[PDB]
DNA sequence: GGGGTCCT
DNA sequence: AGGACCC
């Protein structure tokens, strides 16, 4: 019996922005990347605006829409780490998922609390927030009692986040990662809900597309949808034999457990990042002098990031995207080069070679993306 | 779109 | 090196 919590910040980028220029707190807001509105405050979803939505569809639906550019993730990333560091303080094992989601395993903490309690105040243990599906609490159910303590820690987290960081968000408490994440969004925004075990089927059957299961993306969905498997219950019910023989004993076995609300995966300690990368897409790049400048630019920011980081990377990757999947070359970063200096020149030289490897400087080319990644950190 | 993770 | 997943 684990007690896991999923923390999900409301319209993160927008939130971070609204904290910056408070003048936009009352005004519906979109955060913009090229031609997309990636996220908007609630004041604006109110008006049909949806996450990842065209600026033409955006502006029209709401010509009162305000916009900030969010291509530079710097400030979001920093707040992201302030959030998880904050959660790491409740309990050290925190798993990040993107910039705006965290899992924390609350089991050891829940136990610690209960022991400190006596029969009286156990009376007495109440929920913080919503109980999924208005299910009834049985105070004599040890599992019920533990999930409620969880809800109490969740609430303390949510309050700490707001009081210390001004951030708002949802939490979902449950017995594994799948359910915690599934339940955290039942009441939005800035609310939390807890999942009692006897409501687990209800929760998973509440989904409408098998892709709404975390663990099941485009490819798998499509492959499933071609086997006639469309509902959670189809997947639950479909032939284990056939499914294995179809997506591999690996995928098949686990995504079938997922369909029953079953998820054994541990909450892993994310710790410091295992890669830094910058990218920029564009209409077209067809010269190698543009590239170098672009790449000098990506390489620029990366340098300050790792510089400010305190560890050193031992390999670089260059990623590109061609005219109308991606491609990449990597190589170790040399000994002395891992180090008040002119790291640019040698670095860009490496990237350039790697660059030419993929690109034909003599045969015209059309690139729609450049990216530099520093991995293999020590 | 601008990022990340792990597996193969 | 590429693939799939996540946000
Ligand atoms: N899922 C997804 N998120 C992206 C993408 N590009 C940027 N993001 C960032 C922008 C948003 O701030 C964030 C969306 O994550 P969430 O699903 O948790 O929603 P968000 O926190 O933005 O607001 P919400 O309360 O969920 O409406 O992810 C993308 O391509 N897919
Ligand atoms: Mg959210
Ligand atoms: Mg999914």
Question: Encoding tokens for residue A106?
Answer: 């609350």
A146-162 in b/e form (b: 16+ CB < 10 A) is bbbbbbbbbbebbeebe
For ligand 1, whether the C-beta of A13 sits within 6 Å is: yes
Q: Roughly how many angstroms between the first and final C-alpha of chain A, as a whole number?
A: 36
Who contacts A85 (Cβ-Cβ below 8 Å, separation ≥6)? none
Tell me which residues have their CB within 5 A of the ion that is ligand 3: A 211, 216
Contact yes or no for A269/A94 (Cβ under 8 A): yes
Same domain for A259 and A281 = no
Name the closest nucleotide to A375, judged by C1' and CA: B4
Q: CA A201 to CA A177: how far, in whole Å?
A: 15
Question: Hey, what are A92's tokens?
Answer: 């050290």
The Cα A137–Cα A107 span in angstroms is 19
Name residues 31-50 of chain A with a Cβ under 7 Å from nucleic strand B.
Answer: 33-36, 38
Q: How much is the CA Rg of chain A, to the nearest whole Å?
A: 24
CA distance A288 to A291: 5
Question: For residues A33 and A54, what is the distance between their CA atoms, to the nearest angstrom?
Answer: 10
Residue A220 alpha carbon to ligand 3 centre in Å = 9
Same domain, A363 and A294: yes
Cα angle vertex A190, ends A88, A55, to 5°?
Answer: 105
Residue A210 sits in a domain of what CATH number? 1.10.150.20
* Specified resolution (Å): 2.5
Residue nearest to nucleotide C1 (CA to C1'): A328
Looking up tokens 């959670």, which residue turns up?
A232
Whose CA is closest to atom 5 on ligand 1?
A38
Q: Which nucleotides of C are covered by protein (CB under 7 A)?
A: 1-7
Is any ligand 1 atom within 6 A of the Cβ of residue A11? yes
Question: What distance in Å separates the CA atoms of residue A342 and residue A12, rounded to the nearest whole number?
Answer: 36
- Of A223, A247, A272, the domain-final residue: A272
Q: Considering A195, A225, A260, which residue would you say is the last residue of a domain?
A: A195
Q: State whether the beta carbon of A206 lies below 7 angstroms from any atom of strand B.
A: no
CB of A10 closer than 6 A to ligand 1? yes
Alpha carbons A73 and A198: distance in angstroms, whole number: 41
Annotated ligand binding at A13? The verdict is: yes
Residues A5 and A121 in one domain: yes
Nearest to A205 by CA among A132, A263, A136, A259: A259
Confirm whether A262 is a catalytic residue.
no
Distance CA A188, CA A9 (A): 10
Q: Identify whether the C-beta of residue A159 lies closer than 8 Å to the C-beta of residue A239.
A: no
| SS3 readout for A150-167 | HHHHHHHHHHHHHHHHCC
Please check whether residues A214 and A242 belong to one and the same domain.
Answer: yes
Determine the Cα–Cα distance for residues A8 and A188; give it in Å rounded to an integer: 10
Q: Is the CB of A189 under 6 A from ligand 1?
A: yes
Looking at the fold, whether A134 and A113 belong to one and the same domain comes out as yes
- Domain extent for A16: 11-72
Looking up tokens 């023989």 gives: A245
The structure tokens listed for A115 are 């022991």
Q: What's CA A155's distance to the chain center, in Å?
A: 21
Q: Could you tell me what percentage of chain A is helix, strand and coil, using 3-state DSSP and rounding each to the nearest 5?
A: 45, 20, 35
Quick one: which of A340, A280, A279, A347 has its CA closest to A316? A347
In a shared domain, residues A280 and A323: yes
What is the DSSP secondary structure assignment for residue A309, as one 8-state letter?
T
DSSP tag of A129 = S
* Whole-angstrom distance, CA of residue A186 vs CA of residue A195: 10
Joined tokens for residue A27: 């005004």
Pair A209, A348 in one domain: no
- Based on the domain organization, do A168 and A95 belong to the same domain? yes
Which pair of structure tokens corresponds to residue A95? 């798993």
Residue of A12, A169, A217 best suited for mutating to test ligand 1, as the one with most atoms within 8 Å of CB: A12
> Looking at the 3D structure of chain A, how many domains does it have?
4
Whether residue A365 contacts residue A322, with contact meaning beta carbons closer than 8 Å, is answered with: yes
Using the mean position of ligand 2's atoms as its centre, give its distance from the Cα of residue A159 in Å: 17
The tokens describing A211, both together, are 């892709």
Whether the Cβ atoms of residue A278 and residue A72 lie closer than 8 Å to each other: no
Asked whether A368 and A281 are in contact (CB, 8 A), the reply is yes
| Claim to verify: residue A242 and residue A154 sit in the same structural domain | no
Technique used: X-ray
What residue's CA is closest to ligand 1, atom 7? A38
3-state secondary structure at position A90:
helix
- Residue A224 CA from chain centroid, whole number: 24
Determine which helix (DSSP H) or strand (DSSP E) holds A109, and give its type and residue range.
helix A107-116
Same domain, A116 and A190: yes
């Amino acid at each position: 019996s684990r007690v896991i919590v999923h923390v999900d910040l409301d319209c993160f980028y927008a939130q971070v922005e609204m904290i910056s220029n408070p003048e936009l707190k009352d005004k519906p807001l979109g955060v913009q990347q090229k031609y997309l509105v990636v996220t908007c405050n609630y004041e604006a979803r109110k008006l049909g605006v949806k996450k990842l939505m065209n600026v033409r569809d955006a502006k029209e639906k709401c010509p009162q829409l305000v916009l900030v550019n969010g291509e530079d993730l710097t400030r979001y990333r920093e707040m992201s780490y302030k959030v998880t560091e904050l959660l790491e303080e409740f309990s050290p094992v925190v798993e990040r998922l993107g910039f705006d989601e965290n899992f924390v395993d609350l089991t050891e903490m829940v136990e610690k609390r209960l022991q400190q309690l006596q029969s009286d105040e156990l009376s007495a243990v109440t929920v913080s927030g919503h109980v999924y599906n208005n299910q009834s609490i049985n105070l004599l159910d040890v599992l019920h009692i533990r999930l409620l303590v969880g809800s109490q820690i969740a609430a303390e987290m949510r309050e700490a986040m707001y009081n210390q960081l001004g951030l708002t968000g949802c939490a979902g408490v449950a017995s594994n990662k799948l359910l915690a994440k599934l339940v955290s969004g039942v009441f939005k925004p800035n609310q939390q809900t807890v999942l009692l075990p006897e409501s687990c089927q209800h929760l998973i059957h509440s989904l409408n597309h098998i892709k709404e299961i975390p663990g099941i993306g485009y490819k798998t969905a499509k492959c499933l949808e071609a086997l006639g498997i469309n509902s959670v219950r189809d997947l639950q019910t479909f032939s284990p034999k056939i499914l294995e023989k179809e997506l591999g004993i690996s995928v098949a076995q686990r995504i079938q457990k997922l369909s029953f609300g079953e998820d054994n995966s541990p909450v892993i300690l994310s710790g410091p990042p295992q890669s830094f990368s910058e990218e920029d897409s564009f209409k077209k790049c067809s010269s190698e002098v543009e590239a170098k400048n672009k790449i000098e630019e990506l390489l620029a920011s990366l340098l300050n990031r790792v510089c400010q980081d305190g560890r050193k990377p031992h390999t670089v990757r260059l990623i590109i995207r061609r005219y109308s999947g991606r491609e990449s070359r990597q190589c170790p970063i040399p000994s002395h080069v891992i180090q008040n200096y002119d790291v640019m020149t040698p670095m860009v030289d490496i990237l350039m070679k790697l660059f030419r490897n993929m690109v034909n400087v003599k045969m015209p080319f059309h690139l729609t993306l450049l990216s530099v990644c520093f991995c293999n950190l020590k």
